[PDB]
Coordinates of C-alpha atoms and ligand atoms in Angstrom, one line a residue:
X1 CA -0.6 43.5 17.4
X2 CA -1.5 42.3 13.5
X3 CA -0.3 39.3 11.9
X4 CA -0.4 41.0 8.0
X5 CA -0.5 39.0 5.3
X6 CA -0.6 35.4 4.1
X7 CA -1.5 35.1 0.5
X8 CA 1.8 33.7 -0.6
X9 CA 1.3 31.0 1.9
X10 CA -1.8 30.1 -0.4
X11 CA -0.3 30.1 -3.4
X12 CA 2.9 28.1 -2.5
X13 CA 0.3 25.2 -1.2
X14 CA -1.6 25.5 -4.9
X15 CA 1.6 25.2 -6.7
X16 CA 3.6 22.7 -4.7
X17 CA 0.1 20.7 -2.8
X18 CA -2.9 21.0 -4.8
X19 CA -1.6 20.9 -8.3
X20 CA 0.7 17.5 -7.4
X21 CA -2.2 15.8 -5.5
X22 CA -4.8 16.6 -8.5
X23 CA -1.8 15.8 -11.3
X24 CA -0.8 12.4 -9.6
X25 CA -3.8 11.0 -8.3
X26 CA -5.3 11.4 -11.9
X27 CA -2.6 9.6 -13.8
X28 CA -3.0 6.6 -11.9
X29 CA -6.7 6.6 -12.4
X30 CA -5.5 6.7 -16.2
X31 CA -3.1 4.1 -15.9
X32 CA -5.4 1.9 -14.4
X33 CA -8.6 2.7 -16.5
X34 CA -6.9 2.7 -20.1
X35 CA -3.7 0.1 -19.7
X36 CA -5.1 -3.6 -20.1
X37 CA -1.8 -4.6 -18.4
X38 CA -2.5 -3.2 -15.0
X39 CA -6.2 -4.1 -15.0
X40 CA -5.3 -6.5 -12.2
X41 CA -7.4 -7.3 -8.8
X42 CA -4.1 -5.6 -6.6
X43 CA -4.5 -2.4 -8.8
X44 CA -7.6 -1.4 -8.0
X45 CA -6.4 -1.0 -4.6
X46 CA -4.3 1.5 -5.8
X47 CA -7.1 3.0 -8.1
X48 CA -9.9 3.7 -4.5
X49 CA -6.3 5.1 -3.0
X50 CA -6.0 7.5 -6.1
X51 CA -9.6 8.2 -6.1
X52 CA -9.6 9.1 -1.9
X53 CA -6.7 11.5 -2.4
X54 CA -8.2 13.2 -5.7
X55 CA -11.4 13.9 -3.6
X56 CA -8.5 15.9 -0.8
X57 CA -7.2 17.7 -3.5
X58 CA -10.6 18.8 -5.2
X59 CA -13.1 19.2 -2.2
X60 CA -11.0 19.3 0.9
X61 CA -7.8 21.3 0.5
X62 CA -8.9 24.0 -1.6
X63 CA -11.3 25.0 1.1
X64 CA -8.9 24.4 3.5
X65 CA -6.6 27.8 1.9
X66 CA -9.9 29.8 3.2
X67 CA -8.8 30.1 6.6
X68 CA -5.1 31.5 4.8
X69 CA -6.6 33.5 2.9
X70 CA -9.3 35.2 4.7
X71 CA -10.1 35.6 8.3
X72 CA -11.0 32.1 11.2
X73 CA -15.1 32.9 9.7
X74 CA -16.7 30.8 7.6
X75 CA -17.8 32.6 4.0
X76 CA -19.2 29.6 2.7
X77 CA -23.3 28.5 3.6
X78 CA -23.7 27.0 7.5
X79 CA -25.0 23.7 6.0
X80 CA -21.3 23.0 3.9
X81 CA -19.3 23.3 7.2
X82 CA -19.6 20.1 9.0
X83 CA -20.0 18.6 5.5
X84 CA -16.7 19.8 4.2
X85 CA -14.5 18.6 8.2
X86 CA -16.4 15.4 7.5
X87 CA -15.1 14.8 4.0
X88 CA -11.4 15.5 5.1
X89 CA -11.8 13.1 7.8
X90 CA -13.6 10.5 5.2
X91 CA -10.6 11.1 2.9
X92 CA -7.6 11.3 4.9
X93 CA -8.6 8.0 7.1
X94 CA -9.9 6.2 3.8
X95 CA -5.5 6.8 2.6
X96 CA -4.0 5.6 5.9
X97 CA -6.2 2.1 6.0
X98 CA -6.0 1.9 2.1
X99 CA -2.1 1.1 2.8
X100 CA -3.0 -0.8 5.7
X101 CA -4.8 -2.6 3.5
X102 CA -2.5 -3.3 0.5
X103 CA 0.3 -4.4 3.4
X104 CA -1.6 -6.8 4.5
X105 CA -2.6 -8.1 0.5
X106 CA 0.9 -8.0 -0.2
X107 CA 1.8 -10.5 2.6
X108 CA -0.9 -13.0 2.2
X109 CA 0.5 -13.0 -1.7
X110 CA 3.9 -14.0 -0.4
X111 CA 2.8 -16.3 2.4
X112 CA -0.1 -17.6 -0.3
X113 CA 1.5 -18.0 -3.2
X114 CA -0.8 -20.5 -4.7
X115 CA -4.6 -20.7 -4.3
X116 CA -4.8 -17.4 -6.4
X117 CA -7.8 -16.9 -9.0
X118 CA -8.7 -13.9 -11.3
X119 CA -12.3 -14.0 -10.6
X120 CA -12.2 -14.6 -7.1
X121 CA -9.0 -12.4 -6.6
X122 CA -11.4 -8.7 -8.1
X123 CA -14.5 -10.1 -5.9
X124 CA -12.2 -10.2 -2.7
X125 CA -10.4 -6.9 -3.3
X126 CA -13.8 -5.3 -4.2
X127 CA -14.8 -6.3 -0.6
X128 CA -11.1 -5.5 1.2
X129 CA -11.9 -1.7 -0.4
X130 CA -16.0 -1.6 0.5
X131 CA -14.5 -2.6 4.4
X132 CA -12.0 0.3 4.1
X133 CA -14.4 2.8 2.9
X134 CA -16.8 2.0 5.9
X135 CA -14.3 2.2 8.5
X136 CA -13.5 5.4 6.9
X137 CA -17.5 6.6 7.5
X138 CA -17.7 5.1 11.5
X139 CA -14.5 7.4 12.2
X140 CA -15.6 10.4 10.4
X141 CA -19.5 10.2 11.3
X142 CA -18.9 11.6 15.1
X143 CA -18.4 15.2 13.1
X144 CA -21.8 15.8 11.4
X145 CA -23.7 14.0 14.2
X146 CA -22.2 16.0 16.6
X147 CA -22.2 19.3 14.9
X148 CA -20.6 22.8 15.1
X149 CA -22.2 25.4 17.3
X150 CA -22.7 29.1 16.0
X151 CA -26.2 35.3 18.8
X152 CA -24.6 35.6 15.6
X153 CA -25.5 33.7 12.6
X154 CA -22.1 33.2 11.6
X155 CA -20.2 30.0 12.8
X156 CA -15.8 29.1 12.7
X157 CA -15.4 26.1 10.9
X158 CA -13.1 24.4 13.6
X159 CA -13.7 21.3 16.4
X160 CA -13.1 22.5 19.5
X161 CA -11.6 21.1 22.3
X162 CA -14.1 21.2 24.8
X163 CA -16.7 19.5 22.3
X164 CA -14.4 17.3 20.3
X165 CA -11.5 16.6 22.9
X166 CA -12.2 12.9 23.0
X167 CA -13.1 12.9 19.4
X168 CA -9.5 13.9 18.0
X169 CA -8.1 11.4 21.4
X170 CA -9.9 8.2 19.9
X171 CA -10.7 9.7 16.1
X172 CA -6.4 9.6 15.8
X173 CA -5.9 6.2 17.7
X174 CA -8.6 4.5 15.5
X175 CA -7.5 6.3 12.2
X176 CA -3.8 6.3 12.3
X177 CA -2.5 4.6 15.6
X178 CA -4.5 1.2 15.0
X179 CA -3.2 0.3 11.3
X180 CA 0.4 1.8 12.2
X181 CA 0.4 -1.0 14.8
X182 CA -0.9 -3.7 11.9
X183 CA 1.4 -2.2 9.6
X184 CA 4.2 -2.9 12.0
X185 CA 3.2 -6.5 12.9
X186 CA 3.1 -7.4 9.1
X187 CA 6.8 -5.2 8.1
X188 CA 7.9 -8.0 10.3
X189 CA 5.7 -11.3 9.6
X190 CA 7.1 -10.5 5.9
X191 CA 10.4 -10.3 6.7
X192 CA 10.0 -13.8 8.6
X193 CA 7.3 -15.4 5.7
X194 CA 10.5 -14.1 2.9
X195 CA 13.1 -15.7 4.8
X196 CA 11.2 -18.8 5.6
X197 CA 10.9 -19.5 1.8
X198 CA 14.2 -19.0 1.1
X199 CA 15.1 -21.4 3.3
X200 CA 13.1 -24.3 2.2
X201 CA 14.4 -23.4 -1.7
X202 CA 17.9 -24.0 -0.4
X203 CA 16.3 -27.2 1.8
X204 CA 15.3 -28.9 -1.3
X205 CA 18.1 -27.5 -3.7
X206 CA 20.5 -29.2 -1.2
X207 CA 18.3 -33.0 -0.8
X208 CA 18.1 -32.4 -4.8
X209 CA 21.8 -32.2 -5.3
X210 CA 23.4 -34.4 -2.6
X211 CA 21.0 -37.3 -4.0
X212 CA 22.2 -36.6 -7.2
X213 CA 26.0 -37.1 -6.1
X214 CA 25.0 -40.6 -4.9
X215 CA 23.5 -41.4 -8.3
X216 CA 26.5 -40.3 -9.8
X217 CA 29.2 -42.6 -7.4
X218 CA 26.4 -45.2 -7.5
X219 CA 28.3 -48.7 -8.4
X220 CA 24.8 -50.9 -7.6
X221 CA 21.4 -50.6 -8.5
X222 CA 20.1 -50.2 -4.3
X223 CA 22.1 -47.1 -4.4
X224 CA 20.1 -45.6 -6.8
X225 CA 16.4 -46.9 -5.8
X226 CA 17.0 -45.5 -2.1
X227 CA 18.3 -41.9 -3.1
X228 CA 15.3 -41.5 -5.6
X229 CA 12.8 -42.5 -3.5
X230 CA 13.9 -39.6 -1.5
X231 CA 13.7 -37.5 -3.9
X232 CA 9.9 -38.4 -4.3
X233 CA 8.5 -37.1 -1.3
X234 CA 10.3 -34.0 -1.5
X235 CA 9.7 -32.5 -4.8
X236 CA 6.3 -31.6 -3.7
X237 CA 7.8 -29.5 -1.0
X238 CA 9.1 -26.6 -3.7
X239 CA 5.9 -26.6 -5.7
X240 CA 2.8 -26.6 -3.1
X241 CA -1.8 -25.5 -13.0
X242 CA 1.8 -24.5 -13.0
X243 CA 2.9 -25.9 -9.9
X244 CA 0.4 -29.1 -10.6
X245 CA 2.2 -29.8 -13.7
X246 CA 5.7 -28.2 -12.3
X247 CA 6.2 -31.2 -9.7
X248 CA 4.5 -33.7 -12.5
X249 CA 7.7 -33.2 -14.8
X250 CA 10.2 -34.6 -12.0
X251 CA 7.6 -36.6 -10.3
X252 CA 7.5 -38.8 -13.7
X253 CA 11.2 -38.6 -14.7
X254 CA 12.2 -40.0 -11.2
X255 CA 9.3 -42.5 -11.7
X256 CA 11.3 -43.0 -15.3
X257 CA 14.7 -43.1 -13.2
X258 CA 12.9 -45.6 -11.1
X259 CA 11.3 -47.9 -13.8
X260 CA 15.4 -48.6 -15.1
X261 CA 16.7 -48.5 -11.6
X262 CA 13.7 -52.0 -11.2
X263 CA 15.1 -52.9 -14.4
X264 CA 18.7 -53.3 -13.4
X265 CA 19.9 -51.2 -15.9
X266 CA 22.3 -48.8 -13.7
X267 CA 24.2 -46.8 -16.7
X268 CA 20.4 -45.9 -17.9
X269 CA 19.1 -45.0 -14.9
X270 CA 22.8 -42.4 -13.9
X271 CA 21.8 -41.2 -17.8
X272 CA 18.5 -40.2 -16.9
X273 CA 19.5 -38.2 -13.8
X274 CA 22.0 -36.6 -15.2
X275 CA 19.5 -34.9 -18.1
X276 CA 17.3 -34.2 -15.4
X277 CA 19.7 -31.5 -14.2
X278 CA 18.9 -29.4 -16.9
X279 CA 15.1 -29.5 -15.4
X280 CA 16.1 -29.2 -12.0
X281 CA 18.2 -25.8 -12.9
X282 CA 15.2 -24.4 -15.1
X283 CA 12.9 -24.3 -12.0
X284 CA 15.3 -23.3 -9.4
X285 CA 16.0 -20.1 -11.2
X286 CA 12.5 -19.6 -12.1
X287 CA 11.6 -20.0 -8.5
X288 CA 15.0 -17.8 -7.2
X289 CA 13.8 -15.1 -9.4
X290 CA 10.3 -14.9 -8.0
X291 CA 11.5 -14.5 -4.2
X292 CA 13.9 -11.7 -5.8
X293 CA 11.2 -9.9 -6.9
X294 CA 9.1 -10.3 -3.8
X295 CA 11.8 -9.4 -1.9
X296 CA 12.4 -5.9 -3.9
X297 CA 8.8 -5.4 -4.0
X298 CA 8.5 -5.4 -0.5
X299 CA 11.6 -3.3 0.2
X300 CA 9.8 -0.4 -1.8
X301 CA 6.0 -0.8 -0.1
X302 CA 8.3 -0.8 3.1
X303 CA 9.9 2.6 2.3
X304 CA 7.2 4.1 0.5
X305 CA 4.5 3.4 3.1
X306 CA 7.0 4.8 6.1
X307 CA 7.8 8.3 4.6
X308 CA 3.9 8.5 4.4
X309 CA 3.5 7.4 8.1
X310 CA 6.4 9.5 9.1
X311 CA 4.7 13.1 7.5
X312 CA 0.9 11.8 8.9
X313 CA 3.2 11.4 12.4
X314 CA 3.7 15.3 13.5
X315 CA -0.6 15.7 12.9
X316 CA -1.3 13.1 15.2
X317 CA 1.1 13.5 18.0
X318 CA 0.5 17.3 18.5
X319 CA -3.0 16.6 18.2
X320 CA -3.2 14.2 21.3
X321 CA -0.7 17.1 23.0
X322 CA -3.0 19.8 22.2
X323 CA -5.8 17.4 24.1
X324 CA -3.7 15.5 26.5
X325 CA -1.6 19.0 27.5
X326 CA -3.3 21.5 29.6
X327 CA -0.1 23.3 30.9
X328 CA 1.4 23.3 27.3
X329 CA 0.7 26.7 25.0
X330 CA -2.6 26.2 23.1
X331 CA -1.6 29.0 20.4
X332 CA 2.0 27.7 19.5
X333 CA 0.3 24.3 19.3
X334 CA -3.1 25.1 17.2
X335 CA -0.3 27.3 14.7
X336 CA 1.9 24.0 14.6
X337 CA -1.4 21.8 13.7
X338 CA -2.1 24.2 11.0
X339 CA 1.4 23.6 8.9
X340 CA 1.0 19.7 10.2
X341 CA -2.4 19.4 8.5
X342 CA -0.8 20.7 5.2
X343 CA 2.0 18.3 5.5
X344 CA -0.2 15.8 5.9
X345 CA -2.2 16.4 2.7
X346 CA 1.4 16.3 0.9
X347 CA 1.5 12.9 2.7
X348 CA -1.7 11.4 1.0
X349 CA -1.8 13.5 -2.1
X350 CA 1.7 12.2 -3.7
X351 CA 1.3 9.0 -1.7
X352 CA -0.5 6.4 -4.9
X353 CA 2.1 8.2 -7.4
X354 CA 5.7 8.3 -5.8
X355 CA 5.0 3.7 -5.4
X356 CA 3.7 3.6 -8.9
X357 CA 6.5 5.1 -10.1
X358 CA 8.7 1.8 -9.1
X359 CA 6.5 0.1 -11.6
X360 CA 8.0 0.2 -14.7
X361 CA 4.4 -0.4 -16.9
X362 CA 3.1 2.3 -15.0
X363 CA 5.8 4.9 -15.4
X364 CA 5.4 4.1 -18.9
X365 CA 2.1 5.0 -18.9
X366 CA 2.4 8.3 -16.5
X367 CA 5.7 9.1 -20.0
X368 CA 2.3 8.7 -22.5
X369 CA -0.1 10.4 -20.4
X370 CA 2.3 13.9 -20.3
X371 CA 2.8 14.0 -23.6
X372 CA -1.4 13.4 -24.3
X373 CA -1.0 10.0 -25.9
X374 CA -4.0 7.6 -24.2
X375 CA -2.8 5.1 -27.2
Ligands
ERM1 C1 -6.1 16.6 8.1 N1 -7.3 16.5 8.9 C2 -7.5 17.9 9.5 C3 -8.8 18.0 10.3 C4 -8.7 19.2 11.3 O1 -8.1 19.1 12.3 N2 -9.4 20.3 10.9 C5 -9.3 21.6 11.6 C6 -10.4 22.5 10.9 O2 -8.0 22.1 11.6 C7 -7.4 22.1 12.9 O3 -6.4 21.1 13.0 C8 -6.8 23.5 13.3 C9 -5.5 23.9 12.7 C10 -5.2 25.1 13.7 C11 -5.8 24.6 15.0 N3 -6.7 23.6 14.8 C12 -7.4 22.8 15.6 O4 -7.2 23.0 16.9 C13 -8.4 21.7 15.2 C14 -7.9 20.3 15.7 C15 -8.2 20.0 17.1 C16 -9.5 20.1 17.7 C17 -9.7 19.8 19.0 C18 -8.7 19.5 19.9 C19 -7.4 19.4 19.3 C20 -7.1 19.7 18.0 N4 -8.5 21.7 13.8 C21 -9.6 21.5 13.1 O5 -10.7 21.1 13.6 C22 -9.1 16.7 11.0 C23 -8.4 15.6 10.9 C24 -8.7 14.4 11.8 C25 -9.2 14.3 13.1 C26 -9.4 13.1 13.8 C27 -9.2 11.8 13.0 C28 -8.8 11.9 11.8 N5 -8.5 10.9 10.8 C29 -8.1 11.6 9.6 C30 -8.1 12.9 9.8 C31 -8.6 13.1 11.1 C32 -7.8 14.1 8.9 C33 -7.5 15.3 9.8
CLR2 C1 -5.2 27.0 -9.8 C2 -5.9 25.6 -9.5 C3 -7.2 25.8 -8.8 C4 -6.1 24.8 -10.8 C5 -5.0 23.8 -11.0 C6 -5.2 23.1 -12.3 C7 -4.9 21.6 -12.2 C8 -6.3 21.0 -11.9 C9 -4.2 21.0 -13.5 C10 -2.9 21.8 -13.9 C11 -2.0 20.8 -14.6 C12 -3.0 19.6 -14.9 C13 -2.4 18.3 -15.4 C14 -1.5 18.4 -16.6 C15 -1.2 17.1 -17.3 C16 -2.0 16.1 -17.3 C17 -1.8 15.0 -18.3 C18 -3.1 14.5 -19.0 O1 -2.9 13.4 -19.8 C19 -4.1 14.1 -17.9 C20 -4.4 15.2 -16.9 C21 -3.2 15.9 -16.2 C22 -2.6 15.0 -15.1 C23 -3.6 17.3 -15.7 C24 -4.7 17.3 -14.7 C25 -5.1 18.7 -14.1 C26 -3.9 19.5 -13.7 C27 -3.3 18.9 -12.4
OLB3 C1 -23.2 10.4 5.3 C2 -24.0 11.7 5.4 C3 -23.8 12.4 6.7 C4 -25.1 12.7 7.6 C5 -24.9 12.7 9.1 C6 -26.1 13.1 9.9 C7 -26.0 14.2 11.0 C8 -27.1 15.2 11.2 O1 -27.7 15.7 10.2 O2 -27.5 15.5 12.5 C9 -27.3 16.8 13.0 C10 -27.6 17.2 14.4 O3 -26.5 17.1 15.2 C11 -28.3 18.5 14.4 O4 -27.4 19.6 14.4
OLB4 C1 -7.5 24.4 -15.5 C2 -6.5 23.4 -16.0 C3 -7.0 22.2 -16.9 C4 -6.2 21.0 -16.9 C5 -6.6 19.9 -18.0 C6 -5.5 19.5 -19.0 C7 -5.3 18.0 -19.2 C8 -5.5 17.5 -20.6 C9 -6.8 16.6 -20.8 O1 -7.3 16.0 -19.9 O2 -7.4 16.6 -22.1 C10 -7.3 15.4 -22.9 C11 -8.6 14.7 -23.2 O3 -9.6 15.6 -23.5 C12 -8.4 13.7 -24.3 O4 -8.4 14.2 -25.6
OLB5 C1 -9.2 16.3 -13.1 C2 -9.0 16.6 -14.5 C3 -8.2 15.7 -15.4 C4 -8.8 15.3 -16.8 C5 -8.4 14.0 -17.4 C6 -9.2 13.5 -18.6 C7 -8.7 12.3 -19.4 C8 -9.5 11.8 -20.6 C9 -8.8 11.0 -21.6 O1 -7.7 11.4 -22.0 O2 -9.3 9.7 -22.0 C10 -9.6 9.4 -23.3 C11 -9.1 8.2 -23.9 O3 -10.0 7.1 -23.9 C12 -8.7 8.5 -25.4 O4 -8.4 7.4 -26.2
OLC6 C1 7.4 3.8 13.9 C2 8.1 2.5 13.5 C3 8.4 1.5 14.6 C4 9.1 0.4 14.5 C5 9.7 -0.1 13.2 C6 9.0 -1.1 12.4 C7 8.9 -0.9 10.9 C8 7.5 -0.4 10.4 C9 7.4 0.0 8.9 C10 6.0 -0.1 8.2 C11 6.0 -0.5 6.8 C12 4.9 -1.5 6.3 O1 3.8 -1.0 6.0 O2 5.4 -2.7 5.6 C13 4.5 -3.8 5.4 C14 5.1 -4.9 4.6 O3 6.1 -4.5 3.8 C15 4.0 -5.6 3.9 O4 4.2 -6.3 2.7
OLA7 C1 -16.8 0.5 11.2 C2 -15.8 0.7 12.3 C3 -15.8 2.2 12.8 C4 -15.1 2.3 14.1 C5 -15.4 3.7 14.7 C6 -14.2 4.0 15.7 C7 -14.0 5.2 16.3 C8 -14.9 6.5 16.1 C9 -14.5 7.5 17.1 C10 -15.6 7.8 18.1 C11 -15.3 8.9 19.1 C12 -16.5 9.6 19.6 C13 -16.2 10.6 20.7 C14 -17.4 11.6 20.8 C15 -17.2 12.5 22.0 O1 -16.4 13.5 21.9 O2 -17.8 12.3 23.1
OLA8 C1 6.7 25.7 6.6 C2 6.8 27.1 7.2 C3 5.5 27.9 7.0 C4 4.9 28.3 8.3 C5 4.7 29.8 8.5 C6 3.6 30.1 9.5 C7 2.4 30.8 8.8 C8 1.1 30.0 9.1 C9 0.2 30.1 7.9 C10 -0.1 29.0 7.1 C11 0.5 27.6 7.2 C12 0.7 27.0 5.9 C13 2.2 26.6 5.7 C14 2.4 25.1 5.6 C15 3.4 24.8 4.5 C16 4.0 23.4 4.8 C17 3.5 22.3 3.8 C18 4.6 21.7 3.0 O1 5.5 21.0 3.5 O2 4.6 21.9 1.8
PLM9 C1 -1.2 16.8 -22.7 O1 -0.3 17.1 -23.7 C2 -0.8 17.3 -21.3 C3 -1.2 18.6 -20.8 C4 -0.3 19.7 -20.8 C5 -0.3 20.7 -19.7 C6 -1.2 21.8 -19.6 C7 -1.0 23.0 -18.7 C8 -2.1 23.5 -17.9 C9 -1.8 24.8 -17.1 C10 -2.7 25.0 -15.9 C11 -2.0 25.4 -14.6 C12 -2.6 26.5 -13.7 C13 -2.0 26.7 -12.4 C14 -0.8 27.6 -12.3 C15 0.0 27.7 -11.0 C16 -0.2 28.8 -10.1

């Protein structure tokens, strides 16, 4: 029997792989290099992301149309094999812990709010991406250090199973199994941690108003002294240089509220509540708006991040079956592996530039960057 021919497999995976990864990955370099609006501490996440899946695109997959195009020998020198499984290893674990690693950032911002500082914010995401990138090196190091055996001089650029059985086994637990499982835990300490905050705007939107009613209905001036001094405790509760100035505003007009209320003056004091609602309305919009946003944010990371998981999901199942399996059929499985591998890549390579794309000051910049404008 003969196979035939695959050379249109090779140039469907240029056109609708290779030239999408390459394309992508570099606009969101751009974006992130020439906009002064995204040069941001969180984007620079996205820019090592971008940078990874460029180096796939580049140095990985278009030696990885070799074995479509030609024969399973290597044509290339013996030194650039383990070299070239090694950097799709390096690049394709660096992706999957990249997101890992922007989940978890994205939930310390909501459960953090405060405590946030430009300076300090680029020096710890700096770190975060140096952690990532050696993670990446301890999972793909096994490859080189193990090597690829050859009486002739010519060697197939593949890991076996009976050398690198236990490799893929823990190699696919460690790269995609282990932040899948901390990718899970935070999908759902978000969804509490967004909640939670709603919860406590309503908390102190209701002790705001009701107090307010007793003002208004107040006929004595020890109506009014108890149901501000509630009000005094609790206005710290919805802000913690914004927020330190935020509470300050209330703090000293209940304080002002207070001073009349002392006084005797009850009219005065029912006056001063009463413009205060204007200030109370201005920050519970403000602050409504901002768990709106998280909210929708997180909605998108959430989808986003799953249809990648989802496509990196076939790869690393039939790989453990390939290894697990002994009764199962090695051909039909290594031929499934071999499409899985290229879905994967589609997975990683259009991964940074599909979630940019729900940033509107980004998808500006991607509507320049076609057109050759750079500003
Ligand atoms: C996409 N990339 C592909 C790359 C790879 O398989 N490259 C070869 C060259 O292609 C195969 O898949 C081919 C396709 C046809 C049959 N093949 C095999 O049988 C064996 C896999 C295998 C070996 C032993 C036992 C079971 C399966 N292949 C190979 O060695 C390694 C990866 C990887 C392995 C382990 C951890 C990882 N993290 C990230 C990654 C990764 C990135 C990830
Ligand atoms: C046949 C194969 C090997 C070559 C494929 C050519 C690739 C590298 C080409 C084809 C179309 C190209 C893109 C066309 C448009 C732009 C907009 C520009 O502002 C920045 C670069 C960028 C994003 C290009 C980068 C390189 C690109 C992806
Ligand atoms: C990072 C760079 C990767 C360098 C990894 C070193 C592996 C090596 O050269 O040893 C090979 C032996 O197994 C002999 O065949
Ligand atoms: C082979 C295909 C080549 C793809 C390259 C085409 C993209 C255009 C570009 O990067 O040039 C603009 C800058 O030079 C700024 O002036
Ligand atoms: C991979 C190949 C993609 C090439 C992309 C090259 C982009 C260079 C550019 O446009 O930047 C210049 C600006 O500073 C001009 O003001
Ligand atoms: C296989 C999925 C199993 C269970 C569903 C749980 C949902 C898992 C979805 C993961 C998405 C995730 O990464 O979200 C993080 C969160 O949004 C950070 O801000
Ligand atoms: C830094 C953290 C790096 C963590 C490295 C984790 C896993 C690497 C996988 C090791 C598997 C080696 C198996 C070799 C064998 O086949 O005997
Ligand atoms: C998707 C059906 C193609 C499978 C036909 C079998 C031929 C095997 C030869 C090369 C495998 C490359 C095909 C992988 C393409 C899928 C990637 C994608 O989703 O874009
Ligand atoms: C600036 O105005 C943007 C650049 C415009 C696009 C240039 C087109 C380059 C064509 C190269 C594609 C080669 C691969 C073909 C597919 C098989």
């Amino acid at each position: 029997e003969e196979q035939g021919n695959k050379l249109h497999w090779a140039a469907l995976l240029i056109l609708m792989v290779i030239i999408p990864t390459i394309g992508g990955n570099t606009l969101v370099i751009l974006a992130v290099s020439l906009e002064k609006k995204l040069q941001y501490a969180t984007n620079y996440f996205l820019m090592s992301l971008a940078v990874a899946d460029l180096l796939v695109g580049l140095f990985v997959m278009p030696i990885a149309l070799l074995t479509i195009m030609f024969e399973a020998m290597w044509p290339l020198p013996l030194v650039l094999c383990p070299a070239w499984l090694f950097l799709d290893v390096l690049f394709s674990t660096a992706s999957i812990w990249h997101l890992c690693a922007i989940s978890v950032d994205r939930y310390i911002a909501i459960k953090k709010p405060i405590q946030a500082n430009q300076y300090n914010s680029r020096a710890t995401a700096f770190i975060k991406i140096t952690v990532v990138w050696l993670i990446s090196i301890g999972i793909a190091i096994p490859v080189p250090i193990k090597g690829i055996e050859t009486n002739p001089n010519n060697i197939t650029c593949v890991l076996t199973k009976e050398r690198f059985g236990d490799f893929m086994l823990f190699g696919s637990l460690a790269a995609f199994f282990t932040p899948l499982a901390i990718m899970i835990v935070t999908y759902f300490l978000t969804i509490h941690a967004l909640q939670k905050k709603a919860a406590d705007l309503e908390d102190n939107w209701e002790t705001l108003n009701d107090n307010l009613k007793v003002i208004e209905k107040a006929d004595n001036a020890a109506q009014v002294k108890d149901a501000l001094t509630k009000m005094r405790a609790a206005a710290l509760d919805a802000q913690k240089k914004d927020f330190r100035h935020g509470f300050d505003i209330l703090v000293g007009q209940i304080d002002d509220a207070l001073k009349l209320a002392n006084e005797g003056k009850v009219k005065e004091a029912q006056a001063a509540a009463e413009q205060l609602k204007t200030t109370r309305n201005a920050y519970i919009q403000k602050y409504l708006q901002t768990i709106s946003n998280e909210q929708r944010a997180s909605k998108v990371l959430g989808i986003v991040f799953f249809l990648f998981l989802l496509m990196w999901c076939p790869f690393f199942i039939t790989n453990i079956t390939l290894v697990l399996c002994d009764s199962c059929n090695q051909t039909t499985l290594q031929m499934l592996l071999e499409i899985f591998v290229w879905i994967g890549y589609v997975s990683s390579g259009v991964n940074p530039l599909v979630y940019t794309l729900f940033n509107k000051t980004f998808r500006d910049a991607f509507g320049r960057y076609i057109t050759c404008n750079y500003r």
